[PDB]
Design a protein around this nucleic acid. Structure first.
Ligand code: CA
Ligand code: CA
Ligand code: CA
Ligand code: CA
Ligand code: CA
Ligand code: CA
Ligand code: CA
Ligand code: CA
Ligand code: CA
Ligand code: CA
Ligand code: CL
Ligand code: CL
Ligand code: CL
Ligand code: CL
Ligand code: CL
Ligand code: CL
Ligand code: CL
Ligand code: CL
Ligand code: ZN
Ligand code: ZN
Lengths: 124, 124
DNA sequence: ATGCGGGCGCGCCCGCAT
DNA sequence: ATGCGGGCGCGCCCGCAT
Protein backbone atom coordinates (compact mmCIF):
# COMPACT_ATOMS: atom_id res chain seq x y z
CA UNK A 1 0.00 0.00 0.00
CA UNK A 2 1.95 3.07 1.33
CA UNK A 3 4.82 0.51 1.83
CA UNK A 4 5.23 0.11 -1.99
CA UNK A 5 5.39 3.95 -2.41
CA UNK A 6 7.95 4.18 0.51
CA UNK A 7 10.12 1.45 -1.20
CA UNK A 8 10.08 3.30 -4.56
CA UNK A 9 11.07 6.61 -2.87
CA UNK A 10 13.76 4.77 -0.79
CA UNK A 11 15.47 3.72 -4.08
CA UNK A 12 16.25 7.43 -4.68
CA UNK A 13 17.86 8.19 -1.25
CA UNK A 14 21.42 9.56 -1.38
CA UNK A 15 22.78 7.62 1.64
CA UNK A 16 23.44 10.62 3.90
CA UNK A 17 21.63 8.70 6.67
CA UNK A 18 20.95 5.08 7.78
CA UNK A 19 18.40 2.97 5.89
CA UNK A 20 16.21 2.98 9.04
CA UNK A 21 16.29 6.86 9.37
CA UNK A 22 15.41 7.28 5.64
CA UNK A 23 12.52 4.76 6.02
CA UNK A 24 11.05 6.61 9.08
CA UNK A 25 11.40 10.01 7.27
CA UNK A 26 9.68 8.67 4.09
CA UNK A 27 6.94 6.80 6.07
CA UNK A 28 6.18 10.02 8.07
CA UNK A 29 5.91 12.07 4.81
CA UNK A 30 3.82 9.46 2.88
CA UNK A 31 1.36 9.14 5.83
CA UNK A 32 0.74 12.98 5.80
CA UNK A 33 0.15 12.93 2.00
CA UNK A 34 -2.18 9.84 2.15
CA UNK A 35 -5.35 12.02 1.99
CA UNK A 36 -3.68 14.55 -0.39
CA UNK A 37 -3.58 12.58 -3.73
CA UNK A 38 -2.37 15.53 -5.90
CA UNK A 39 0.55 16.40 -3.53
CA UNK A 40 1.61 12.69 -3.21
CA UNK A 41 1.56 12.32 -7.08
CA UNK A 42 3.70 15.49 -7.42
CA UNK A 43 6.19 13.96 -4.90
CA UNK A 44 6.43 10.50 -6.61
CA UNK A 45 6.73 12.13 -10.10
CA UNK A 46 9.42 14.61 -8.88
CA UNK A 47 11.55 11.99 -7.01
CA UNK A 48 11.12 9.11 -9.61
CA UNK A 49 12.21 11.34 -12.59
CA UNK A 50 14.93 13.19 -10.56
CA UNK A 51 13.10 16.52 -11.03
CA UNK A 52 13.30 16.22 -14.86
CA UNK A 53 9.90 17.88 -15.49
CA UNK A 54 8.66 20.86 -13.36
CA UNK A 55 6.63 19.74 -10.31
CA UNK A 56 4.06 21.41 -8.02
CA UNK A 57 4.47 22.04 -4.22
CA UNK A 58 4.47 19.08 -1.75
CA UNK A 59 3.47 20.45 1.67
CA UNK A 60 3.24 19.36 5.28
CA UNK A 61 2.10 21.43 8.29
CA UNK A 62 4.81 23.52 9.97
CA UNK A 63 5.47 22.96 13.70
CA UNK A 64 5.55 26.04 16.03
CA UNK A 65 9.37 26.03 16.14
CA UNK A 66 9.81 24.90 12.49
CA UNK A 67 11.67 21.65 13.16
CA UNK A 68 10.22 18.22 12.30
CA UNK A 69 11.14 15.23 14.54
CA UNK A 70 11.92 11.87 12.88
CA UNK A 71 13.15 8.89 15.01
CA UNK A 72 14.22 11.16 17.89
CA UNK A 73 16.01 13.73 15.71
CA UNK A 74 14.84 17.27 14.90
CA UNK A 75 15.62 19.16 11.68
CA UNK A 76 14.00 21.62 9.28
CA UNK A 77 11.58 19.49 7.15
CA UNK A 78 12.64 20.92 3.76
CA UNK A 79 16.32 20.23 4.77
CA UNK A 80 15.53 16.63 5.87
CA UNK A 81 13.91 15.77 2.51
CA UNK A 82 16.46 17.72 0.36
CA UNK A 83 19.35 15.89 2.23
CA UNK A 84 17.54 12.57 1.69
CA UNK A 85 16.87 12.87 -2.07
CA UNK A 86 19.43 15.39 -3.45
CA UNK A 87 22.33 16.58 -1.20
CA UNK A 88 23.39 13.97 1.45
CA UNK A 89 26.06 16.35 2.89
CA UNK A 90 23.63 19.36 2.98
CA UNK A 91 24.18 21.83 5.86
CA UNK A 92 22.20 24.78 7.31
CA UNK A 93 21.57 27.96 5.19
CA UNK A 94 22.53 26.15 1.94
CA UNK A 95 19.02 26.10 0.39
CA UNK A 96 17.28 28.67 -1.77
CA UNK A 97 13.74 28.23 -3.02
CA UNK A 98 12.78 28.64 -6.69
CA UNK A 99 10.64 31.75 -7.62
CA UNK A 100 7.49 29.67 -8.41
CA UNK A 101 7.47 27.87 -4.99
CA UNK A 102 4.54 29.34 -3.00
CA UNK A 103 4.98 27.33 0.25
CA UNK A 104 8.79 27.51 0.73
CA UNK A 105 9.98 27.32 4.37
CA UNK A 106 11.28 31.00 4.18
CA UNK A 107 7.78 32.25 3.07
CA UNK A 108 6.49 31.68 6.70
CA UNK A 109 3.32 29.75 5.78
CA UNK A 110 1.70 27.09 8.07
CA UNK A 111 2.18 24.74 5.03
CA UNK A 112 5.88 24.03 4.23
CA UNK A 113 6.99 22.81 0.80
CA UNK A 114 9.26 19.74 1.17
CA UNK A 115 9.63 19.19 -2.62
CA UNK A 116 13.48 18.94 -2.92
CA UNK A 117 13.28 20.18 -6.57
CA UNK A 118 11.65 23.41 -5.25
CA UNK A 119 15.00 24.33 -3.71
CA UNK A 120 18.47 24.79 -5.15
CA UNK A 121 21.81 24.59 -3.32
CA UNK A 122 23.72 27.80 -2.45
CA UNK A 123 27.02 28.56 -0.61
CA UNK A 124 26.64 29.32 3.16
CA UNK B 1 14.31 27.57 47.43
CA UNK B 2 11.99 24.79 46.03
CA UNK B 3 15.10 22.52 46.55
CA UNK B 4 14.80 22.83 50.38
CA UNK B 5 11.06 21.89 50.20
CA UNK B 6 11.91 18.91 47.85
CA UNK B 7 14.61 17.70 50.37
CA UNK B 8 12.15 17.87 53.32
CA UNK B 9 9.49 15.91 51.35
CA UNK B 10 12.19 13.40 50.17
CA UNK B 11 12.87 12.52 53.86
CA UNK B 12 9.33 11.04 54.00
CA UNK B 13 9.59 8.76 50.88
CA UNK B 14 8.92 5.06 51.50
CA UNK B 15 11.65 3.70 49.17
CA UNK B 16 9.34 2.03 46.62
CA UNK B 17 11.40 3.75 43.89
CA UNK B 18 14.96 5.04 43.27
CA UNK B 19 16.14 8.27 44.93
CA UNK B 20 16.34 9.86 41.44
CA UNK B 21 12.69 8.86 40.52
CA UNK B 22 11.37 10.22 43.88
CA UNK B 23 13.32 13.50 43.34
CA UNK B 24 11.87 14.00 39.79
CA UNK B 25 8.31 13.20 41.07
CA UNK B 26 8.64 15.66 44.01
CA UNK B 27 10.31 18.39 41.85
CA UNK B 28 7.47 18.09 39.25
CA UNK B 29 4.79 18.41 42.02
CA UNK B 30 6.52 21.31 43.89
CA UNK B 31 6.94 23.27 40.59
CA UNK B 32 3.13 23.02 39.88
CA UNK B 33 2.31 24.20 43.45
CA UNK B 34 4.86 27.11 43.34
CA UNK B 35 2.14 29.70 42.50
CA UNK B 36 -0.46 27.91 44.72
CA UNK B 37 0.79 28.79 48.29
CA UNK B 38 -2.25 27.31 50.16
CA UNK B 39 -2.06 23.93 48.31
CA UNK B 40 1.78 23.70 48.81
CA UNK B 41 1.35 24.45 52.60
CA UNK B 42 -1.35 21.74 52.85
CA UNK B 43 1.10 19.28 51.16
CA UNK B 44 4.12 20.10 53.41
CA UNK B 45 1.92 20.01 56.58
CA UNK B 46 0.29 16.67 55.54
CA UNK B 47 3.59 14.90 54.58
CA UNK B 48 5.75 16.38 57.47
CA UNK B 49 3.22 15.32 60.21
CA UNK B 50 2.37 11.96 58.50
CA UNK B 51 -1.27 13.05 58.04
CA UNK B 52 -1.71 13.54 61.83
CA UNK B 53 -4.08 16.54 61.49
CA UNK B 54 -6.75 16.72 58.71
CA UNK B 55 -5.46 18.44 55.54
CA UNK B 56 -7.10 20.16 52.54
CA UNK B 57 -6.87 19.02 48.85
CA UNK B 58 -3.53 19.28 46.94
CA UNK B 59 -4.35 19.38 43.22
CA UNK B 60 -2.63 19.26 39.86
CA UNK B 61 -4.24 19.41 36.38
CA UNK B 62 -5.39 16.07 34.97
CA UNK B 63 -3.99 14.96 31.58
CA UNK B 64 -6.46 13.81 28.85
CA UNK B 65 -5.70 10.13 29.50
CA UNK B 66 -5.26 10.55 33.30
CA UNK B 67 -1.65 9.38 33.55
CA UNK B 68 1.20 11.68 34.65
CA UNK B 69 4.69 11.10 33.14
CA UNK B 70 7.74 11.38 35.45
CA UNK B 71 11.26 10.51 34.11
CA UNK B 72 9.86 8.51 31.18
CA UNK B 73 7.29 6.57 33.23
CA UNK B 74 3.50 7.03 33.21
CA UNK B 75 1.20 6.38 36.17
CA UNK B 76 -1.95 7.77 37.77
CA UNK B 77 -0.79 10.92 39.69
CA UNK B 78 -2.64 10.13 42.94
CA UNK B 79 -1.08 6.59 42.81
CA UNK B 80 2.45 7.97 42.18
CA UNK B 81 2.31 10.26 45.24
CA UNK B 82 0.49 7.72 47.51
CA UNK B 83 3.17 5.06 46.58
CA UNK B 84 5.91 7.62 47.27
CA UNK B 85 4.74 8.81 50.72
CA UNK B 86 2.53 6.00 52.17
CA UNK B 87 2.38 2.59 50.37
CA UNK B 88 5.62 1.73 48.45
CA UNK B 89 4.13 -1.61 47.20
CA UNK B 90 0.79 0.04 46.14
CA UNK B 91 -0.90 -1.51 43.07
CA UNK B 92 -3.82 -0.50 40.80
CA UNK B 93 -7.42 -0.26 42.21
CA UNK B 94 -6.14 -0.25 45.84
CA UNK B 95 -7.08 3.37 46.64
CA UNK B 96 -10.31 4.82 47.97
CA UNK B 97 -10.81 8.52 48.54
CA UNK B 98 -12.12 9.95 51.84
CA UNK B 99 -15.70 11.46 51.80
CA UNK B 100 -14.46 15.08 52.27
CA UNK B 101 -12.05 14.95 49.25
CA UNK B 102 -13.63 17.11 46.51
CA UNK B 103 -10.96 16.62 43.78
CA UNK B 104 -10.32 12.84 44.05
CA UNK B 105 -9.18 11.15 40.80
CA UNK B 106 -12.51 9.11 40.64
CA UNK B 107 -14.59 12.37 40.82
CA UNK B 108 -13.57 13.16 37.15
CA UNK B 109 -12.50 16.79 37.72
CA UNK B 110 -9.80 18.57 35.60
CA UNK B 111 -8.05 19.12 39.02
CA UNK B 112 -6.83 15.85 40.64
CA UNK B 113 -6.13 15.61 44.38
CA UNK B 114 -2.67 14.06 44.97
CA UNK B 115 -2.82 14.44 48.79
CA UNK B 116 -1.91 10.83 49.89
CA UNK B 117 -3.87 11.34 53.18
CA UNK B 118 -7.02 11.97 51.05
CA UNK B 119 -6.96 8.30 50.09
CA UNK B 120 -7.03 5.09 52.10
CA UNK B 121 -5.84 1.63 51.03
CA UNK B 122 -8.38 -1.06 50.05
CA UNK B 123 -8.12 -4.71 48.81
CA UNK B 124 -8.17 -5.12 44.96
C1' DA C 1 -16.72 -2.74 23.94
C1' DT C 2 -13.47 -0.73 26.85
C1' DG C 3 -9.15 0.31 28.84
C1' DC C 4 -4.04 -0.71 29.63
C1' DG C 5 0.37 0.49 28.35
C1' DG C 6 4.25 1.69 25.86
C1' DG C 7 6.41 4.20 21.40
C1' DC C 8 7.20 8.47 19.60
C1' DG C 9 6.29 13.49 17.96
C1' DC C 10 5.30 18.57 18.96
C1' DG C 11 5.18 21.89 22.54
C1' DC C 12 7.49 23.85 26.32
C1' DC C 13 11.55 24.86 28.44
C1' DC C 14 16.10 26.55 29.28
C1' DG C 15 21.13 26.75 28.90
C1' DC C 16 24.12 28.28 25.77
C1' DA C 17 26.60 30.57 21.41
C1' DT C 18 26.77 34.36 19.00
C1' DA D 1 18.53 40.39 21.40
C1' DT D 2 17.80 36.35 18.91
C1' DG D 3 18.02 31.65 17.68
C1' DC D 4 20.14 26.84 18.10
C1' DG D 5 19.57 22.54 20.02
C1' DG D 6 18.65 18.94 23.01
C1' DG D 7 15.76 17.02 27.35
C1' DC D 8 11.45 15.59 28.56
C1' DG D 9 6.12 15.60 29.16
C1' DC D 10 1.25 15.26 27.17
C1' DG D 11 -1.25 14.06 23.15
C1' DC D 12 -1.94 10.79 19.64
C1' DC D 13 -1.71 6.31 18.24
C1' DC D 14 -2.31 1.43 18.06
C1' DG D 15 -1.61 -3.38 19.40
C1' DC D 16 -3.14 -6.10 22.78
C1' DA D 17 -5.74 -8.29 27.12
C1' DT D 18 -9.82 -8.92 28.88
CA1 CA E 1 3.53 1.16 22.65
CA1 CA F 1 18.22 24.13 28.25
CA1 CA G 1 22.16 25.10 26.12
CA1 CA H 1 23.81 32.98 26.29
CA1 CA I 1 23.96 27.52 22.30
CA1 CA J 1 18.39 20.27 26.05
CA1 CA K 1 0.22 0.10 19.87
CA1 CA L 1 -0.38 -3.56 22.56
CA1 CA M 1 -7.61 -6.94 21.46
CA1 CA N 1 -3.13 -5.22 26.22
CL1 CL O 1 19.61 8.59 3.00
CL1 CL P 1 21.92 7.75 10.29
CL1 CL Q 1 0.92 17.60 7.38
CL1 CL R 1 12.98 28.39 1.96
CL1 CL S 1 10.39 6.31 47.06
CL1 CL T 1 13.09 3.10 40.61
CL1 CL U 1 -0.96 21.55 37.65
CL1 CL V 1 -10.12 8.41 43.56
ZN1 ZN W 1 7.24 24.50 -3.40
ZN1 ZN X 1 -8.54 15.67 48.21
Amino acid sequence: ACLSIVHSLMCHRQGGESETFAKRAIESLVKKLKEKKDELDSLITAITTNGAHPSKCVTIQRTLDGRLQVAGRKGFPHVIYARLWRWPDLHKNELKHVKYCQYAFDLKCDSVCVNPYHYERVVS
